[PDB]
Amino acid sequence: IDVLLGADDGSLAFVPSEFSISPGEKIVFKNNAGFPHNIVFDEDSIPSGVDASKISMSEEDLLNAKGETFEVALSNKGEYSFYCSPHQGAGMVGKVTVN
């Protein structure tokens, strides 16, 4: 599934921000608008036993040009909360469910 970082009107959101996937399906996050942007998974808000480090950017790593992507695949089922560290306060957050 593709997820935009930044809406086409420059809003600071994931598009889509809530979605479901199958195990091992890829998520491609692509730098769209209002960068820099990143994707960090919340260690306290993903399935038990998952290593967030494995599926996130570092807090300090950024995508700062149009069309940069980060790709990840999830396999454990459950809900995964994620956010953009620099724009978390702006409401740039999301949640994916692996079902």
Active-site amino acid positions: 37, 84, 87, 92
Our measurement of the distance from residue 12's CA atom to the centroid of its chain's CA atoms, rounded to an integer in Å, reads: 13
Annotated binding site for Cu cation: 37, 84, 87, 92
User: How many residues sit close enough to Cu ion to count as binding (CB under 5 A)?
Assistant: 4
Go through the chain and list every residue after which a break occurs, taking a C to next N gap over 2.5 angstroms, comma-separated: none
Residue 88 in contact with residue 41, Cβ under 8 Å? no
For Cu ion, which is the closer residue by CB, 34 or 74? 34
Between 70 and 89, how does the x/- string for binding to Cu ion read (CB under 5 A)?
Answer: --------------x--x--
For position 56 contacting Cu ion by CB under 5 A, the verdict is no
CB count, 10 Å around CB of 35? 19
Annotated binding site: 37, 84, 87, 92
